[PDB]
Nucleic acid binder design. Structure first.
Ligand SMILES: [Mg+2]
Ligand SMILES: [Mg+2]
Ligand SMILES: [Mg+2]
Ligand SMILES: [Mg+2]
Ligand SMILES: [Mg+2]
Ligand SMILES: [Mg+2]
Ligand SMILES: [Mg+2]
Ligand SMILES: [Mg+2]
Ligand SMILES: [Mg+2]
Ligand SMILES: [Mg+2]
Ligand SMILES: [Mg+2]
Ligand SMILES: [Mg+2]
Ligand SMILES: [Mg+2]
Ligand SMILES: [Mg+2]
Ligand SMILES: [Mg+2]
Ligand SMILES: [Mg+2]
Ligand SMILES: [Mg+2]
Ligand SMILES: [Mg+2]
Ligand SMILES: [Mg+2]
Ligand SMILES: [Mg+2]
Ligand SMILES: [Mg+2]
Ligand SMILES: [Mg+2]
Ligand SMILES: [Mg+2]
Ligand SMILES: [Mg+2]
Ligand SMILES: [Mg+2]
Ligand SMILES: [Mg+2]
Ligand SMILES: [Mg+2]
Ligand SMILES: [Mg+2]
Ligand SMILES: [Mg+2]
Ligand SMILES: [Mg+2]
Ligand SMILES: [Mg+2]
Ligand SMILES: [Mg+2]
Ligand SMILES: [Mg+2]
Ligand SMILES: [Mg+2]
Ligand SMILES: [Mg+2]
Ligand SMILES: [Mg+2]
Ligand SMILES: [Mg+2]
Ligand SMILES: [Mg+2]
Ligand SMILES: [Mg+2]
Ligand SMILES: [Mg+2]
Ligand SMILES: [Mg+2]
Ligand SMILES: [Mg+2]
Ligand SMILES: [Mg+2]
Ligand SMILES: [Mg+2]
Ligand SMILES: [Mg+2]
Ligand SMILES: [Mg+2]
Ligand SMILES: [Mg+2]
Ligand SMILES: [Mg+2]
Ligand SMILES: [Mg+2]
Ligand SMILES: [Mg+2]
Ligand SMILES: [Mg+2]
Ligand SMILES: [Mg+2]
Ligand SMILES: [Mg+2]
Ligand SMILES: [Mg+2]
Ligand SMILES: [Mg+2]
Ligand SMILES: [Mg+2]
Ligand SMILES: [Mg+2]
Ligand SMILES: [Mg+2]
Ligand SMILES: [Mg+2]
Ligand SMILES: [Mg+2]
Ligand SMILES: [Mg+2]
Ligand SMILES: [Mg+2]
Ligand SMILES: [Mg+2]
Ligand SMILES: [Mg+2]
Ligand SMILES: [Mg+2]
Ligand SMILES: [Mg+2]
Ligand SMILES: [Mg+2]
Ligand SMILES: [Mg+2]
Ligand SMILES: [Mg+2]
Ligand SMILES: [Mg+2]
Ligand SMILES: [Mg+2]
Ligand SMILES: [Mg+2]
Ligand SMILES: [Mg+2]
Ligand SMILES: [Mg+2]
Ligand SMILES: [Mg+2]
Ligand SMILES: [Mg+2]
Ligand SMILES: [Mg+2]
Ligand SMILES: [Mg+2]
Ligand SMILES: [Mg+2]
Ligand SMILES: [Mg+2]
Ligand SMILES: [Mg+2]
Ligand SMILES: [Mg+2]
Ligand SMILES: [Mg+2]
Ligand SMILES: [Mg+2]
Ligand SMILES: [Mg+2]
Ligand SMILES: [Mg+2]
Ligand SMILES: [Mg+2]
Ligand SMILES: [Mg+2]
Ligand SMILES: [Mg+2]
Ligand SMILES: [Mg+2]
Ligand SMILES: [Mg+2]
Ligand SMILES: [Mg+2]
Ligand SMILES: [Mg+2]
Ligand SMILES: [Mg+2]
Ligand SMILES: [Mg+2]
Ligand SMILES: [Mg+2]
Ligand SMILES: [Mg+2]
Ligand SMILES: [Mg+2]
Ligand SMILES: [Mg+2]
Ligand SMILES: [Mg+2]
Ligand SMILES: [Mg+2]
Ligand SMILES: [Mg+2]
Ligand SMILES: [Mg+2]
Ligand SMILES: [Mg+2]
Ligand SMILES: [Mg+2]
Ligand SMILES: [Mg+2]
Ligand SMILES: [Mg+2]
Ligand SMILES: [Mg+2]
Ligand SMILES: [Mg+2]
Ligand SMILES: [Mg+2]
Ligand SMILES: [Mg+2]
Ligand SMILES: [Mg+2]
Ligand SMILES: [Mg+2]
Ligand SMILES: [Mg+2]
Ligand SMILES: [Mg+2]
Ligand SMILES: [Mg+2]
Ligand SMILES: [Mg+2]
Ligand SMILES: [Mg+2]
Ligand SMILES: [Mg+2]
Ligand SMILES: [Mg+2]
Ligand SMILES: [Mg+2]
Ligand SMILES: [Mg+2]
Ligand SMILES: [Mg+2]
Ligand SMILES: [Mg+2]
Ligand SMILES: [Mg+2]
Ligand SMILES: [Mg+2]
Ligand SMILES: [Mg+2]
Ligand SMILES: [Mg+2]
Ligand SMILES: [Mg+2]
Ligand SMILES: [Mg+2]
Ligand SMILES: [Mg+2]
Ligand SMILES: [Mg+2]
Ligand SMILES: [Mg+2]
Ligand SMILES: [Mg+2]
Ligand SMILES: [Mg+2]
Ligand SMILES: [Mg+2]
Ligand SMILES: [Mg+2]
Ligand SMILES: [Mg+2]
Ligand SMILES: [Mg+2]
Ligand SMILES: [Mg+2]
Ligand SMILES: [Mg+2]
Ligand SMILES: [Mg+2]
Ligand SMILES: [Mg+2]
Ligand SMILES: [Mg+2]
Ligand SMILES: [Mg+2]
Ligand SMILES: [Mg+2]
Ligand SMILES: [Mg+2]
Ligand SMILES: [Mg+2]
Ligand SMILES: [Mg+2]
Ligand SMILES: [Mg+2]
Ligand SMILES: [Mg+2]
Ligand SMILES: [Mg+2]
Ligand SMILES: [Mg+2]
Ligand SMILES: [Mg+2]
Ligand SMILES: [Mg+2]
Ligand SMILES: [Mg+2]
Ligand SMILES: [Mg+2]
Ligand SMILES: [Mg+2]
Ligand SMILES: [Mg+2]
Ligand SMILES: [Mg+2]
Ligand SMILES: [Mg+2]
Ligand SMILES: [Mg+2]
Ligand SMILES: [Mg+2]
Ligand SMILES: [Mg+2]
Ligand SMILES: [Mg+2]
Ligand SMILES: [Mg+2]
Ligand SMILES: [Mg+2]
Ligand SMILES: [Mg+2]
Ligand SMILES: [Mg+2]
Ligand SMILES: [Mg+2]
Ligand SMILES: [Mg+2]
Ligand SMILES: [Mg+2]
Ligand SMILES: [Mg+2]
Ligand SMILES: [Mg+2]
Ligand SMILES: [Mg+2]
Ligand SMILES: [Mg+2]
Ligand SMILES: [Mg+2]
Ligand SMILES: [Mg+2]
Ligand SMILES: [Mg+2]
Ligand SMILES: [Mg+2]
Ligand SMILES: [Mg+2]
Ligand SMILES: [Mg+2]
Ligand SMILES: [Mg+2]
Ligand SMILES: [Mg+2]
Ligand SMILES: [Mg+2]
Ligand SMILES: [Mg+2]
Ligand SMILES: [Mg+2]
Ligand SMILES: [Mg+2]
Ligand SMILES: [Mg+2]
Ligand SMILES: [Mg+2]
Ligand SMILES: [Mg+2]
Ligand SMILES: [Mg+2]
Ligand SMILES: [Mg+2]
Ligand SMILES: [Mg+2]
Ligand SMILES: [Mg+2]
Ligand SMILES: [Mg+2]
Ligand SMILES: [Mg+2]
Ligand SMILES: [Mg+2]
Ligand SMILES: [Mg+2]
Ligand SMILES: [Mg+2]
Ligand SMILES: [Mg+2]
Ligand SMILES: [Mg+2]
Ligand SMILES: [Mg+2]
Ligand SMILES: [Mg+2]
Ligand SMILES: [Mg+2]
Lengths: 124, 138
RNA sequence: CAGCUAGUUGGUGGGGUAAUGGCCCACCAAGGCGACGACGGGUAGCCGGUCUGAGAGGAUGGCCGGCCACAGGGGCACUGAGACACGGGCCCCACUCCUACGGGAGGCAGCAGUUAGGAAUCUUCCGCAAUGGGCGCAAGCCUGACGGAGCGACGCCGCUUGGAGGAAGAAGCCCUUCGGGGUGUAAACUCCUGAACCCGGGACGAAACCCCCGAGGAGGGGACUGACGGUACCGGGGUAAUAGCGCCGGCCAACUCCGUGCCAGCAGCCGCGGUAAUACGGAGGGCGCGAGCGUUACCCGGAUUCACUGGGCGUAAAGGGCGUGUAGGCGGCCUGGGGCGUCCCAUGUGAAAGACCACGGCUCAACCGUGGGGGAGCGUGGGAUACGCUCAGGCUAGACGGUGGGAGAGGGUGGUGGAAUUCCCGGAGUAGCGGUGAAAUGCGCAGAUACCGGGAGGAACGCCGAUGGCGAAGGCAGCCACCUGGUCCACCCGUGACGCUGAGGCGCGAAAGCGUGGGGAGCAAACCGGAUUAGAUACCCGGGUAGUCCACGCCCUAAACGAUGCGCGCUAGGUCUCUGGGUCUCCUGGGGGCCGAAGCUAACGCGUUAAGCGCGCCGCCUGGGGAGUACGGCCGCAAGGC
RNA sequence: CCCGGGCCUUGUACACACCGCCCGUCACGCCAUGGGAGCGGGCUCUACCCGAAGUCGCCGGGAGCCUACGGGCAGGCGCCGAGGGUAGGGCCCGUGACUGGGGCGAAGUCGUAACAAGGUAGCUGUACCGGAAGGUGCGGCUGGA
RNA sequence: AAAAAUGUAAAA
RNA sequence: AGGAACUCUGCAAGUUGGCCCCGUAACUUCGGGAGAAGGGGUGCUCCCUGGGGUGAUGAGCUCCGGGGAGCCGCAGUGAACAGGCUCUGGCGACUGUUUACCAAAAACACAGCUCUCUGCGAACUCGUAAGAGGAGGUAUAGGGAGCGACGCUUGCCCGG
């Protein structure tokens, strides 16, 4: 543009919205797992993904993905939301924390125990 | 009606030099003289003098160039590598004494209009004054 | 969010306060504010500072420091130098508790501590010993301010889990061309040190108020007190003494084996997995980092992806459809005063904490003390005048005007000419015409087609006519006249910077469409029929309405296309065309088209008719889809448009 | 001319490359969203009615107390006044039978409109019409020859 | 100036 | 005391009622919706005061009004005259007309739309006729038919 154009109009501020509606951007939100079902993946994949809708205590209701090999969440489990979408499942924009509350960790796991919530074992 | 005589003037030089002309004219003016005055003081023009274009006081700016070049496309060197205006009639650029720019680490010059005359990028600094940054040359 | 305002704006007089003031009252006058964004809505305490960043900028205001505001919600005034008063008071509201039912108590957004909520945030500690505060002649009293401890890898910093040696190289584990390779000096083991732990000693922080001579002062000499603490620190005695997390396809540093078989599962981006995966899981090994590693979240960065620095708009997102002009923005050559912008000096200022540099303190650091530096901006005084600005005088190069000529499908009105189509009348004449790729529907023995004469009506204008001209765009063609805009060249005659651009606004704006009235030849959505086709709401054929035309009014869109906004300046030229000037195998001004110097460009391609070099102004773009939709607002009869 | 092949040229939205690609209705599932008889909820504006405490103003009289008799205090009325109440508008949020279109999907159905004269050049404003893409009309643009 | 429709879904 | 529980139906009755001022939505053909709604005032006494008519420019007379102080009752248009309101659907646009004497409507009439006849000695109507109306009008006129303001719009079928 010109100088006057800037003097009047001005550069429009960027401003970007969040990829995750988790309230106060709180690290993790707590909720009670309502539905615990397995949905089929999207375009390039097919491997029945263990997902679970969780009616937050913050009044919300979203779907979260359970990592690891299996789990133990029923119709009334409590759990935390990690926050992190899955490009293979339409709508799932929240991971589900492991080892926290009713949500147990992963059995047998060795490497990367951190993410999959598994207190280090003992070989001896 | 034009706007900044200097703007189009510096352009006369630019377009001319690009095609390697002997010299070019431009409506006579006080400030333009100062421009060439310094544009010769540091050595970028062979010189200048008021001429006539049908009863119209102009200014013949005699251009300076470099030695002939060997190899593909014998392009004669450009004395005035680059000259562009800074303080536009749109944006009047006023700089302070300890703000005056250093055109290409000294290799260049900043023709500006001080509050006590017209000086180079260094000359203005020496005298210890600031002014409107007309343009730079290198 | 586009208009807002009755104490509203101002005035006179008065009330009230420490004091000015619609702060408040009575009376009077209509003013006050706003696209430089009033009014509304949303959000939020502000700064010093902090975070990031090459800087400019962006983000931010936790701790400490300064100002502000509140003390359950909400109002009030009393006391006082000061309050609308956290630990005061009165009243209403919600809530809690007592109650002899008449009444009464109470406020942690003070330290600590509950409970709720949440992802998540500490002991109901010690002392007035130090510092500061209140009262007091003093002694001394109180002090959850503070000094200090306690819990939490929450952060930054220092340290420990050891050091030297030690096999051509244990054991196990992994790999293997079965030779060997790897873990790996790693360990075992030898030797030295010695955190932890033990014993003894054991602070600074403290001096002063208090006593004495002098004069109850100045000066000088004497005396009391330590929460932390029996802590840190000093000396001696002293045991090898916790290691974890992420990654290993590319980005990105780290490769192999088994298992699995589009399962399980990974995923930040691209992607991997469907029998041999360095990408899922385990292992061996390696890479990084270390009392940490890693995830999620949020901020700056990369992002020159809102571009001042520092973008761009022919086809990639983007020139407004075109014109007129309001604000605003910009400003030709010379001379003069002013000195507003701006430039320089001096000065007040910019407090402390911080950041930076320097020295120093705590064993170092973190932390901290001390000193030095210049700081943007603003206040005052002085100075300069170059360009911007401003008043003033002069010029003619921009723009305008005069005189004189020219070209043109520029526009509007009235009139008018031939050709041809259809129709009707009359003449003559007979079996077919028409139509397609083919054919049919259709038209004709009631006399068609073809041809001849007369008439009626509507619409469009052949040849001239083009690589043409004209206008702002849309757009404009037979012919004559009227009225009328724009444009060009010559004479350099007049004016004397009068200019460029243009948010909003005003006007124009193809075609289709709507409204009242008029006209209707041909053509022609829709619609009817024939044929093709699986189907054929279509391509072709036959018939046919609105519309196409006139008037007046509205609609306002388009591939409105050069897909290229407007204006002034500079930058080879060759070629032909429209038009104008001139003693003219040629020169000069305006317009149209091709090819190309330099140059720009992602390429194509542009290139004096720029997409070149440069200034001024508006318009506009910031991934695709969603969607030119939805809502709101405005316009319209509607369709629909902005 | 049919099938197959070669060199040059033109076009292209095709690139294990015309068995390529590709459009729209309809059908099933999913996600978000617009309108919707309404309902519910917050904030806000105006008019009026009631009106605590309290300052201020008046009275303090047929009534109380105080008094250096001039006055004071109590008390009463009034103004304003928190909030409460009634009626009516503005904005925002949630919700709602049904409905509109949109996005999404290894597979369906119906055609083939688009890219090659895509086998009627295509695109386009507007109009009309049809299961659907789309056809046709009036004009316009080449991004057609 | 050339009557004639259509090929779903797994690797460079 | 309650407040539509009555009943086919708030039928009837009751509520509201006049003026003054405040204030007033959806929607809309911008005219309206409007008296929308909802709400305040209304008497008497004293005092100040603005304007018009007549008339001399004022005295009296007379019309409409402004401000302040106060008095009495349960009640101030103190009696009589004197809308109850709102939301939503159907039909008909609307004012109008009708079954004198059980129906006032959604019926008819209407403006405006369309079709059709009629060229004047008009068509049509009454009359046997003369004649008259039409009309001392002339296709922007007249007769007949249907539809019924306005907006959007009106599809295919001549075989009978
Ligand atoms: Mg399970
Ligand atoms: Mg449990
Ligand atoms: Mg040369
Ligand atoms: Mg010279
Ligand atoms: Mg007042
Ligand atoms: Mg006063
Ligand atoms: Mg006063
Ligand atoms: Mg006070
Ligand atoms: Mg006043
Ligand atoms: Mg007044
Ligand atoms: Mg603003
Ligand atoms: Mg708020
Ligand atoms: Mg706030
Ligand atoms: Mg940067
Ligand atoms: Mg920094
Ligand atoms: Mg805090
Ligand atoms: Mg509280
Ligand atoms: Mg309170
Ligand atoms: Mg309060
Ligand atoms: Mg006090
Ligand atoms: Mg307290
Ligand atoms: Mg207090
Ligand atoms: Mg008891
Ligand atoms: Mg008792
Ligand atoms: Mg109390
Ligand atoms: Mg109390
Ligand atoms: Mg109380
Ligand atoms: Mg308490
Ligand atoms: Mg507390
Ligand atoms: Mg504390
Ligand atoms: Mg606590
Ligand atoms: Mg507790
Ligand atoms: Mg809890
Ligand atoms: Mg005592
Ligand atoms: Mg060693
Ligand atoms: Mg000692
Ligand atoms: Mg001492
Ligand atoms: Mg002493
Ligand atoms: Mg003392
Ligand atoms: Mg003494
Ligand atoms: Mg003494
Ligand atoms: Mg003393
Ligand atoms: Mg000890
Ligand atoms: Mg020791
Ligand atoms: Mg020791
Ligand atoms: Mg030893
Ligand atoms: Mg050892
Ligand atoms: Mg060891
Ligand atoms: Mg040892
Ligand atoms: Mg890593
Ligand atoms: Mg790996
Ligand atoms: Mg791995
Ligand atoms: Mg690598
Ligand atoms: Mg498996
Ligand atoms: Mg992994
Ligand atoms: Mg992908
Ligand atoms: Mg394998
Ligand atoms: Mg494989
Ligand atoms: Mg692996
Ligand atoms: Mg990987
Ligand atoms: Mg991986
Ligand atoms: Mg490992
Ligand atoms: Mg960022
Ligand atoms: Mg940036
Ligand atoms: Mg961007
Ligand atoms: Mg960009
Ligand atoms: Mg971005
Ligand atoms: Mg860009
Ligand atoms: Mg474009
Ligand atoms: Mg244009
Ligand atoms: Mg102006
Ligand atoms: Mg001057
Ligand atoms: Mg002077
Ligand atoms: Mg001077
Ligand atoms: Mg300055
Ligand atoms: Mg200074
Ligand atoms: Mg300063
Ligand atoms: Mg200083
Ligand atoms: Mg500063
Ligand atoms: Mg200082
Ligand atoms: Mg400072
Ligand atoms: Mg230094
Ligand atoms: Mg040092
Ligand atoms: Mg030091
Ligand atoms: Mg140091
Ligand atoms: Mg040191
Ligand atoms: Mg040191
Ligand atoms: Mg310091
Ligand atoms: Mg300092
Ligand atoms: Mg120094
Ligand atoms: Mg300054
Ligand atoms: Mg003339
Ligand atoms: Mg003409
Ligand atoms: Mg004509
Ligand atoms: Mg025959
Ligand atoms: Mg026939
Ligand atoms: Mg026959
Ligand atoms: Mg044209
Ligand atoms: Mg004319
Ligand atoms: Mg003319
Ligand atoms: Mg001439
Ligand atoms: Mg002359
Ligand atoms: Mg002249
Ligand atoms: Mg002249
Ligand atoms: Mg003159
Ligand atoms: Mg203009
Ligand atoms: Mg206007
Ligand atoms: Mg107009
Ligand atoms: Mg038309
Ligand atoms: Mg019409
Ligand atoms: Mg129509
Ligand atoms: Mg016809
Ligand atoms: Mg028919
Ligand atoms: Mg047909
Ligand atoms: Mg036809
Ligand atoms: Mg129609
Ligand atoms: Mg015509
Ligand atoms: Mg138009
Ligand atoms: Mg456009
Ligand atoms: Mg112009
Ligand atoms: Mg010529
Ligand atoms: Mg000339
Ligand atoms: Mg030319
Ligand atoms: Mg070219
Ligand atoms: Mg070149
Ligand atoms: Mg290039
Ligand atoms: Mg090229
Ligand atoms: Mg050229
Ligand atoms: Mg030229
Ligand atoms: Mg040329
Ligand atoms: Mg988008
Ligand atoms: Mg549109
Ligand atoms: Mg709308
Ligand atoms: Mg538009
Ligand atoms: Mg050959
Ligand atoms: Mg050959
Ligand atoms: Mg070849
Ligand atoms: Mg592709
Ligand atoms: Mg195909
Ligand atoms: Mg393919
Ligand atoms: Mg909704
Ligand atoms: Mg509601
Ligand atoms: Mg509010
Ligand atoms: Mg008493
Ligand atoms: Mg009161
Ligand atoms: Mg009151
Ligand atoms: Mg009140
Ligand atoms: Mg109130
Ligand atoms: Mg209300
Ligand atoms: Mg309301
Ligand atoms: Mg709603
Ligand atoms: Mg729906
Ligand atoms: Mg329906
Ligand atoms: Mg679509
Ligand atoms: Mg599908
Ligand atoms: Mg199927
Ligand atoms: Mg499909
Ligand atoms: Mg087509
Ligand atoms: Mg084509
Ligand atoms: Mg094409
Ligand atoms: Mg079309
Ligand atoms: Mg055109
Ligand atoms: Mg060709
Ligand atoms: Mg042909
Ligand atoms: Mg099919
Ligand atoms: Mg395929
Ligand atoms: Mg009763
Ligand atoms: Mg009822
Ligand atoms: Mg009934
Ligand atoms: Mg009665
Ligand atoms: Mg009344
Ligand atoms: Mg009455
Ligand atoms: Mg009323
Ligand atoms: Mg009503
Ligand atoms: Mg009323
Ligand atoms: Mg009333
Ligand atoms: Mg009279
Ligand atoms: Mg009289
Ligand atoms: Mg009364
Ligand atoms: Mg209905
Ligand atoms: Mg009716
Ligand atoms: Mg009626
Ligand atoms: Mg009607
Ligand atoms: Mg009707
Ligand atoms: Mg009658
Ligand atoms: Mg009658
Ligand atoms: Mg009657
Ligand atoms: Mg009757
Ligand atoms: Mg009756
Ligand atoms: Mg009636
Ligand atoms: Mg009737
Ligand atoms: Mg009727
Ligand atoms: Mg009608
Ligand atoms: Mg008869
Ligand atoms: Mg007659
Ligand atoms: Mg007659
Ligand atoms: Mg007559
Ligand atoms: Mg008629
Ligand atoms: Mg009817
Ligand atoms: Mg009807
Ligand atoms: Mg119709
Ligand atoms: Mg019909
Ligand atoms: Mg039909
Ligand atoms: Mg018939
Ligand atoms: Mg027939």
């Amino acid at each position: 543009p010109t100088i006057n154009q800037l003097v009047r109009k001005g550069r429009e501020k960027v401003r970007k919205k969040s990829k995750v509606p988790a309230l106060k951007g709180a690290p993790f939100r707590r909720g009670v797992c309502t539905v615990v079902r397995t949905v089929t993946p999207k375009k390039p994949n097919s491997a029945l993904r263990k997902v679970a809708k969780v009616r937050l205590t913050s009044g919300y209701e979203v779907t979260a993905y359970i990592p690891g090999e299996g789990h133990n969440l029923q119709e009334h489990s409590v759990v935390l939301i990690r926050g992190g979408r899955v490009k293979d499942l339409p709508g799932v924009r929240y991971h589900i924390v492991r080892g926290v509350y009713d949500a147990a960790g992963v059995k047998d796991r060795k490497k990367s125990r951190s993410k999959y919530g598994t207190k280090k074992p003992k070989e001896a | 009606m034009l706007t900044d005589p200097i703007a189009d003037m510096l352009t006369r030089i630019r377009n001319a030099t690009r095609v390697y002309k002997e010299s070019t004219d431009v409506p006579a003016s006080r400030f333009k003289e100062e421009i060439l005055r310094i544009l010769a003081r540091e050595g970028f023009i062979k010189g200048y003098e008021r001429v006539d274009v049908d009863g119209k006081p102009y200014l013949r700016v005699y251009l300076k160039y470099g030695p002939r070049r060997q190899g593909p496309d014998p392009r004669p060197e450009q004395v005035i590598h680059h000259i562009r205006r800074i303080s536009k009639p749109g944006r009047r650029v006023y700089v302070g004494v300890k703000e005056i720019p250093r055109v290409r680490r000294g290799l260049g010059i900043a023709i500006l209009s001080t509050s006590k005359g017209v000086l180079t990028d260094r000359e203005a600094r020496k005298l210890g004054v600031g002014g409107e940054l007309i343009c730079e040359v290198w």
